[PDB]
Amino acid sequence: KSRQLKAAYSIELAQDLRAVHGMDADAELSGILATEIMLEINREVVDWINYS
Amino acid sequence: RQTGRGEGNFIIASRNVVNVLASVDTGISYAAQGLATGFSTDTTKSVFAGVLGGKYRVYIDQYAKQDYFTVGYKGPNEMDAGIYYAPYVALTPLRGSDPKNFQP
Amino acid sequence: GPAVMGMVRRAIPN
Amino acid sequence: MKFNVLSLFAPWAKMDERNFKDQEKEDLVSITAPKLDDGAREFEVSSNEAASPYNAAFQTIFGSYEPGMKTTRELIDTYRNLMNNYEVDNAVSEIVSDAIVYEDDTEVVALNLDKSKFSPKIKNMMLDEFSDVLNHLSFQRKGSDHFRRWYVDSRIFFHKIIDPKRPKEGIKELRRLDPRQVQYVREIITETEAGTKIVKGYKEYFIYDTAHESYACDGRMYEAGTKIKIPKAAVVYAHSGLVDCCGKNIIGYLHRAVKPANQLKLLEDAVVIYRITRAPDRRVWYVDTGNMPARKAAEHMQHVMNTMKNRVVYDASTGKIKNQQHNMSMTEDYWLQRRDGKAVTEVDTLPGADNTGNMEDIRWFRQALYMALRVPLSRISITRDELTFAKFIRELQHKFEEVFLDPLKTNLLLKGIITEDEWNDEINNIKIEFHRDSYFAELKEAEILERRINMLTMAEPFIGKYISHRTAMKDILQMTDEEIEQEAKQIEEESK
Amino acid sequence: LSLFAPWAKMDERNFKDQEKEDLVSITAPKLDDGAREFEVSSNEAASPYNAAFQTIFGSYEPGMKTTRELIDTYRNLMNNYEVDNAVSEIVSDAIVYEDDTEVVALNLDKSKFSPKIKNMMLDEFSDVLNHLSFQRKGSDHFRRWYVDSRIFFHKIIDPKRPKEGIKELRRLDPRQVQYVREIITETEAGTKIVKGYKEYFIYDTAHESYACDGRMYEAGTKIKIPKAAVVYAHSGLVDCCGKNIIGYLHRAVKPANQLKLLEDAVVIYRITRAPDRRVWYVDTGNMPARKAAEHMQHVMNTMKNRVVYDASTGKIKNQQHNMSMTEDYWLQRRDGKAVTEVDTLPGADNTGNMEDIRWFRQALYMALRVPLSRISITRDELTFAKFIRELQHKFEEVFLDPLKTNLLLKGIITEDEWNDEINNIKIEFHRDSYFAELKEAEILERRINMLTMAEPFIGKYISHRTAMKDILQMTDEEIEQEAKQIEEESK
Amino acid sequence: QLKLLEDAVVIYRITRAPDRRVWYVDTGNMPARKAAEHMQHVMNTMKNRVVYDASTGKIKNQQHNMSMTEDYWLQRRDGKAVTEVDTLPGADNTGNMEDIRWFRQALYMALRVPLSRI
C-alpha cells in the first residue's frame, strides 16, 4: 500500500519569498511534504503496535 | 514466554512514565527518588530517552491519548519483530508543471 | 510471482 | 552546514569557522562560478540563511547529492568488481607496488625538509610528526592497502580523533571512512542582483548516506548515520582529478577500463558458452504416434524415446563414462521399428560445438584493456613507455601525498609548532619523497653512465685542444662545477 | 568456560584499558579490516558468561554458511590440475630452508631494551617454532593460509602455572571459526565512544559432520574464545562488503573452472561420436503390433555389433580371424519406396583449432599468481619475489603473536616494551641459496663492468671513493674496511 | 567510427553465441487454449535448463555432471513427418579482425601523435 502528497508552488511566490527571507519555497516545501509522510509512517507503525 | 525468541528489549511509553523512570533508581536499592536525570524526558532532542538498566530501549510516545506503555521484543532478524515495513518505493520526488501556465 | 521476503521457523528452546 | 551542537566535531569546526570568517574578509569576489576545481558537491545558498530549519537543511544538503550518490555508489561498486577480476587486478597490483615501495632495511616514503625553516628543531618535530602520521596509518606495513583503495575508489577519507581536553598531544589515529556511505558537499553562501558573484566560503562539510534502508548485496554490518555533519578540518582525504564532463562526477583510475573490461568479459563468456554448449552429442527423436489421443500417443512415443535415450553421464571426477562396461563400445547403435511403409519415425541430429576460432579478437581486446588500465607495453633497458609510466607513478604519488600532508600540517598547527601563517608562508615546499626500488634505479643510472663514459672516450683526442676538461666534465659527464671541484679535491688526496 | 579464565583476564584488562583510553569519539568502527561486527546493549556486559550467544547467532548466521562454501570451494580449486602446483610453488618459495640452514627465526638486530631480554626472546622463539613444529609443518600451515585465506590456533594456559604451562598450538578447523566484534555503546543518535569491541572468537564445536563423510548431528552449542586465546591472522583481502575475506586462490574461482569445464567439453566432444554411428530400422508393417516386433528383433540379432573393444589388451573382443576386409549387412525392402535405408549419423569432426584451451590455460596460470618464469633477473620475477615477501610478512603474525604472548605471560617483558620494540623485532629467514647467489653475481657483474668502463677516468674526473660508492655501490664504511684489509695483505 | 566498428565486432561475437532453436508444431483447427497444449508439451518439457553462470566457474542446474548426449523429441500426431525443431546460425569465427587495426592507426594519426607510439 502507497501514499503521496503534492505542494505545486507558484513561481511568483517563490521569487518573492527568496527576496524577503532568502528562502527557496521549494526545498522547504519539499522538506515539509517528505517529513509529513515520514511522520505518518512513524505514527502508523506505533499505532499498529499499540493496536495489535 | 509466548514468542519463544527473546525477552522484551524495548518500551515506548507516555511522558509521565518516563518522567518516573528518570527520577527513580532502577538498580537494586533501598528506595530512590529525586530530580529526573536517568533518561531524557525531552522529546525535543529525542524520542529515545535511554536504556533501562542497560536492558530495555526506552522511548516516548508523544501522542499517548492519556497514559500507558507498551513493552515488546525485537530480535536480530527482521521477521522476529512481529511487525515489519517492507518498502518497494520510498520518498520518491514528483516533479513537473502545469503546461497551461507553467506553475510548478 | 511475488517476491519472497524470507521465512521463519519456530525456534528451538534450550 | 553544522546545524547542530557537535560534541565531537566542535574542536575542528572552530578552525574552519575562523577560516570562513577570514574568507568573508577576502576579495574573492565578482566571480560568477564558484571557486571550485574539484571535490565536494556544491549547493546554491543565500547570504543570510537566518532560519536553517531541518526541512531546509535536509534539502540543502540532499539536493546536491541525491543522483550524485546513486551514480557514485554504482561507480564504486563497479570499480571494486572490476578490481577483483583477472587482468585488472594485476594492473592495480603493479601500480600499487611502484606507487608504494617497501624494501628490506630501507626507508619508506618520507618527508624531506631540505629547504629553509626557522630552526632544525622545527624540522625535527615535523619529521617526527610525519613518522607518527605513518604510525597511525601503520603505512610502513599497510600503506599499500590504503593506497590501493584510494586508486580504485578514486578517493579515500579518514576520521580524525581529538581528545579534545589536551588537543596538542590529544591527536589520535585515523580511521578510513567507507566509500558508498561517505559523501562530501559545499555551499555557495550568497545571492545578489542577477545571481551571486561575490565571495563563497564553501564551509566544506562531510556527510553520509547512512545506508540503513538500502541493504548491501550482503554484509551491511554498519550504517553511517543520517544527520551527520562533519567539518572539513575533521577529515583527512585525497582524491584524483578524474572527472566526467559535468558536476563532480569523480571517477576512479580504472574508470577508463570499465567499458573494455566488461566488454572483454562478455566476449570471453561468449566463447566459453559457444564452445561448451553443443559439445556433447545432440539428437531429436521423432515418433509416428498418429491416429491417437495424446493420452495413448505418448506410449508409442516412449517406446522410442525411453529406449533410445543415452544413459551416458560423464564422470567429471575421474575421466570415465558411467555404466559403460565392457571397456569401450565400438558403436553408438540405435534402432527403430516402423509400423508401416512410412518414414515418419526417425532421428534428426543437431549441429555441435564447431570450433572455428582462432579467437583472435580476444587477444586484441585483452591488449586494449591493458592499455586502458595503464599497463606498460613492457608487461603482460630504458624506453619512453617505461619512463612515461614512471612519470605517471610520480604524479599519482603526488596526488596521494595529500593523505600525509593534511594530518601533518594539522597536527603541527594544533601543537603550536607552526602558526597558520608560517605554515602557508613556508609551504610552498613540504615535499615528501617516495622510496624507490634501487634495482631499477641502478640500472637506469648505469645506462646513463655508460653513455657518458662512451662519449668522453670519443671526445678524448681533442679535449686538450678544442674543448677543456672542465667543459667535457660539465657537458659529457654532466657534472656541476662544485661537483667537479669536489671530485678534483678528492682525487688530489687519493693520488698521494 | 573456566578454561579460558586466564585469557579472559588478559582481554578484560585490555578492554578496560580501551575504555580508559582516549581513542574514542570515532564515527566509524575503529578498524581497517578484521572481525564481523554487531551492535549491543551499551552496558559493560550482560550477567551470564554465555550471554554473548545473544549477539553471536545474529552476527554469524550467513557468515558461517558462506565461509563453509568458500573454503570447500578453495580446497576444490586446489584439487585441480596445475592449481595444486601453482600453490605448491608459492608455498615452496614462501617457506624456505635447506640442509643445515636456518628456518624463519627471530632477529633482534635493532635497538632493544636489554640484551637479557634479547636472549630470552630468541631462546623462547625456538619454542614458538616447536609449537607449530614449523621445521616439519611450516609448509603445511602456509599452504592452508594461502588457500583457506587465513590461519587460527588455540592457545593453551596451564592454567595454574601460566608462566610454565605453555603448550603446543592447535590449528583450528576453518569454516568453524569466526571472528567477531561488539559495539558496546549508545548516545544521542550514533555512538562514537568506548568502542573497544573485545574482538573475541566463536566456534562451531562439531567434529563428526562433514561435507563428504560424517554423521551424528547433536544439539549443538556455539561457545567461548577470548581474543587472547586465539592465534590468528588473515590475508588483507576482502570483497565489496562485510568482512568477506578472500583467499589468494579466490581469483581462480572463475577461470579455473571455465577452463576445467571447457577441457571436459573438449574431452566430451571428441569421445562422444568417436564410435561408429547409425540407426538400423525394420519395416514391420502389415503385422499385428505384438508380432511385428518379432521380425525386427530377429533382424537385430544378425546386424548386431558384437564387437566390444578390449582396452586391457588393444584388440577387439572375440573378433577372430585376423581382420575382415568388410562389414556385410542387408535388409529386404517391403516396397519399392525410400522408407527402408540405413540412417548414418555425423561424427565429432576435427574442425579445430584446438587452441582456445591454450589461451584459457595461460589465463589461469597467470590468474594463479605465478611468474612467467615457470610453466636471469626480470621485472616479473622480482615482482613475484616481492609478492612472496608480502605473503611471508602477513603469515609472520603466526609467530609474532605467540612470541609476544609467551613473553608477557612469563613476566619477562612489559607489553609496552614489546610495543615499542616493534616497530621491528621481525623474524628473518633463509632464502633459496642458489638463486640468491645468481642474483648477487649478476649485480656484481654489472658493477664490475661499469667500473671497468669508467677506468680511464677514475684517476682523472671521477675519484676512487666516488667510483666505489656510486659505480661499484660500496658504502663509505665498506670502503674504509676493504682498504684496511688490502693494507694488511700487502704486508 | 572506430568505436562503432569495435561495437560491431563485439556484437557479432556475442549475439548468436548460445545454442538457438525453434520448436515447431502443427495446431490447426484447435481452440487457442487447446492449440497451446501441443506446443506446451514440447516447449516446457524440452527446455535446456542448464546454464553457464557468467559470475562463477559453474553451470546452473547442471547435475548430472554432464551428459555425453542431449536427448530431445517431438511427437508427430499427423500420419506424416510434420513436426520438427530447427536451429539458428551461431557466432561462427570469421575474423580476420583487420579493420580495427586500420582504423585504429588512422585515428592515431588524427590524434596528432608520432608513429613511434603504440
The full DSSP string for F12-24 is: HHHTT-S--EEEE
Using DSSP, state whether D457 is helix, strand or coil: helix
DSSP H stretches of helix in D138-245: 139-153
Burial environment of residue D154 by CB neighbours within 10 A (0 to 12, 13 to 18, 19 or more): buried
Q: How far apart are CA E322 and CA D293, in angstroms?
A: 54
Element (H, E) at D286: strand D281-288
Q: How far apart are CA E331 and CA E106, in angstroms?
A: 87
**Of E285, E342, E309, F69, the residue nearest D335 (C-alpha):** E342
Q: How far apart are CA D64 and CA D45, in angstroms?
A: 11
Q: How far apart are the first and last CA of chain A?
A: 19
Strands (DSSP E) found in E184-254: 201-203, 230-234
**Of E218, E247, E230, the residue nearest E180 (C-alpha):** E230
* D58 contacts A31? CB cut-off 8 A: yes
Taking the Cβ of residue D226 and every Cβ of chain A, the question of whether any pair is shorter than 8 Å is answered with: no
D324: its cell numbers = 559403460
Cα separations in angstroms, D482 against D469, D476, D479:
14, 16, 8
* A31 contacts D55? CB cut-off 8 A: yes
Data resolution in angstroms: 4.5
Pairing of β D346-349 and β D281-288: antiparallel
Q: How far apart are CA F107 and CA F101, in angstroms?
A: 10
CA atoms within 13 A on the CB side of E241: 17
Q: What is the DSSP letter of E44?
A: S
Answer yes or no: are the C-beta atoms of B62 and B15 closer than 8 Å: yes
D228-238 per-residue burial string, b: 16 or more CB within 10 A, e: under 16: bbbbbbbbbbb
Answer yes or no: are the C-beta atoms of D259 and F49 closer than 8 Å: no
Chain B residues with CB under 8 Å of C13 CB are 4
* A11 contacts B103? CB cut-off 8 A: yes
Interface test with E, best of D180, D338, D361 (most E CBs within 10 A): D338
Q: How far apart are the first and last CA of chain D?
A: 74
**Alpha-carbon dihedral sign for residues E59, E64, E65, E69:** positive
If phi > 0 it is left, if psi is from -120 to 50 it is alpha, else beta; for residue B29 that is beta
Length of chain D: 496
Q: How far apart are CA D67 and CA D73, in angstroms?
A: 10
Length of chain E: 491
F21: its cell numbers = 532453436
Chain B residues with CB under 8 Å of A48 CB are 83
Cα separations in angstroms, D321 against D34, E313, E373, F65:
72, 19, 37, 11
Pairing of β D281-288 and β F69-76: parallel
Q: How far apart are CA E187 and CA B40, in angstroms?
A: 11
Beginning with the edge strand found earlier in the chain, give each strand of the sheet holding D41-45 in spatial order. Answer: D41-45, D182-189, D206-208
Taking the Cβ of residue A48 and every Cβ of chain B, the question of whether any pair is shorter than 8 Å is answered with: yes
Q: How many CB atoms lie within 10 A of CB E193?
A: 18
B89: its cell numbers = 518505493
Residues 19-78 of chain B whose Cβ lies under 8 A from any Cβ of chain A? 61, 63, 70, 72
* C8 contacts B79? CB cut-off 8 A: yes
**Of E186, E149, E161, the residue nearest E42 (C-alpha):** E186
Chain D residues with CB under 8 Å of E110 CB are none
* A9 contacts B12? CB cut-off 8 A: no
E207: β partners = none
**D/A Cβ contact: 3+ pairs below 8 Å:** yes
CA atoms within 13 A on the CB side of B1: 0
Q: How far apart are CA E285 and CA E293, in angstroms?
A: 10
* D456 contacts E466? CB cut-off 8 A: no
E89-103 per-residue burial string, b: 16 or more CB within 10 A, e: under 16: bbbebbbbbeeeeee
Taking the Cβ of residue A1 and every Cβ of chain B, the question of whether any pair is shorter than 8 Å is answered with: no
Using DSSP, state whether B98 is helix, strand or coil: strand
Which residues make Cβ contacts (< 8 Å) with residue D458, sequence separation at least 6? none
**Of B19, B43, B53, B44, the residue nearest B33 (C-alpha):** B19
Residue B72 CA, chain-centre distance (Å), reads 11
Length of chain A: 52
Q: How far apart are CA E422 and CA E440, in angstroms?
A: 30
Chain D residues with CB under 8 Å of A5 CB are none
E130: its cell numbers = 616447536
Element (H, E) at B10: strand B10-13
**Of E467, E438, E474, E469, the residue nearest E453 (C-alpha):** E467
**What's phi and psi for E38, nearest 5 deg?**
-165, 145
Radius of gyration (C-alpha) of chain E in whole angstroms:
35
* D51 contacts A23? CB cut-off 8 A: yes
Interface test with D, best of F50, F56, F66, F96 (most D CBs within 10 A): F66
Which residues make Cβ contacts (< 8 Å) with residue D215, sequence separation at least 6? none
Partner residue opposite B54 with nearest CB, options E42, E57, E59:
E42
Burial environment of residue E76 by CB neighbours within 10 A (0 to 12, 13 to 18, 19 or more): middle
D172: its cell numbers = 589520535
Q: How far apart are CA D436 and CA E446, in angstroms?
A: 20
E77: nearest CA partner in chain F: F57
Which residues make Cβ contacts (< 8 Å) with residue D89, sequence separation at least 6? D83, E251
Q: How many CB atoms lie within 10 A of CB E30?
A: 19
Q: How far apart are CA E467 and CA F115, in angstroms?
A: 40
E435-447 per-residue burial string, b: 16 or more CB within 10 A, e: under 16: eeeebeeeeeeeb
Q: How far apart are CA B89 and CA A2, in angstroms?
A: 8
* B72 contacts A50? CB cut-off 8 A: no
Q: How far apart are CA E180 and CA E60, in angstroms?
A: 8
D158: β partners = D176, D236
Using DSSP, state whether D186 is helix, strand or coil: strand
CA atoms within 13 A on the CB side of E294: 6
Cis bond leading into E244, ω under 30°? no
Q: How far apart are CA D465 and CA E159, in angstroms?
A: 89
Q: How far apart are CA E82 and CA E259, in angstroms?
A: 12
E140: its cell numbers = 603445511
Partner residue opposite E58 with nearest CB, options B46, B51, B76:
B76
**Of D179, D168, D173, the residue nearest E26 (C-alpha):** D173
D22: β partners = none
* E43 contacts B48? CB cut-off 8 A: no
Q: How far apart are CA B27 and CA B23, in angstroms?
A: 12
Write out the residues of chain F at the interface with chain D, using a CB-CB cutoff of 8 A: 9-10, 13-14, 17-19, 21, 37, 41, 52, 54, 59, 64-81, 83-85, 87, 90-93, 95, 97, 100, 116, 118
What is the DSSP track for E441-457? HHHHHHHHHHHHHHGGG
CA angle at E413 for the pair E411 and E417, rounded to the nearest 5°? 145
D145: its cell numbers = 592497502
Using DSSP, state whether E84 is helix, strand or coil: helix
